[PDB]
Every structure is written in structure tokens, then in C-alpha cells.
Subunit: 89 residues, 2 copies
């Protein structure tokens, strides 16, 4: 297992009302910036991932533009949402 | 009350179901959703979630996007709301 424990916690169960900082890659700095843009709960970021048809390039670019995520952070967040979807959607 | 199409949708994960599997989304609406990129049910779920599950704004967006009338948008909203309560 190469993922963070944090990723594994997220993908292990439905996300319900979890905050955006429960997503892998989304530390407190990125999470504050996402919340200030209206992306307060993880499911709102899931929504964007889904409206972008789960496209890695568009989602990671959107995350960079919206909260300044770097490549590792956007990869981790994408991978967490992708694996969550594979398990639960 | 509810249609069987609604109950069938809310009973299980949606996976790669087409947009027409959503309650209220018939052939005409599905066509116009697909023309706009919303070809699978999960893409419309995505919009529902980005709008924070807000009934008024989601139903208005659906009317604006594909021409859904009030019953169609009611049906579609309700199926996504109940799916989310069961699976999200």
C-alpha cells in the first residue's frame, strides 16, 4: 500500500457530510481556500470531479486554479476521489 | 408518490448508468443533456452536488439546460436526493 492512511480512511466508507479536508492531498491550507470558494464539504469536490467526467487533467487543473494545489496534492485528491467512486458510485 | 424508474434508480449505485436512467429524464431530455456533455447519470449527480443539493437551483439549472418542466425536474431532483441519502 502506497497511499496515505488518510486516503484509505476516505475510500473505506461513504463520505456523507465529511469536510473537504478529509480528502487526501487537502491539508488545512488548501482546505481553507476551497471552503472560501464554496467547496466546504468533500461531496462538493466530488461533484466537480463528476461534472468533469472524472478527467484527471481537467480536475487537477481545476484544483490548481481554485486552491493552488501542487502536483502531488492534486494527484492525491484525484486518486482519493477516483478510488472512492470505484467503491461507492 | 414515486415511479418504478425512481425506485430502481435509488435502489443501487448508479455506476455508468446513462442519463436517461434518472427519473423524469425521458428521451427528449436525455438527448439534450447528452448534447451538453451530461451523457451519464453521474454527471448530473455532479451538478446536484456542486449546487450543494439545493432544490431550487438544481431544478432551475435542469430547466435551463435541457428544458425540463416542473414535474420532470421534481422527479429528477427527488431521485438524486434519495440516491444521495442512501449511498453518499
Amino acid at each position: 500500500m502506497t497511499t496515505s492512511q488518510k486516503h484509505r480512511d476516505f475510500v473505506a466508507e461513504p463520505m456523507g457530510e465529511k469536510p473537504v479536508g478529509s480528502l487526501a492531498g487537502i491539508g488545512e491550507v488548501l482546505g481553507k481556500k476551497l471552503e472560501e470558494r464554496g467547496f466546504d464539504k468533500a461531496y462538493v469536490v466530488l461533484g466537480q470531479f463528476l461534472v468533469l467526467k472524472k478527467d484527471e487533467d481537467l480536475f487537477r487543473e481545476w484544483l490548481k486554479d481554485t486552491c493552488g494545489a501542487n502536483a502531488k496534492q492534486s494527484r492525491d485528491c484525484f486518486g482519493c476521489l477516483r478510488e472512492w467512486c470505484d467503491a461507492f458510485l
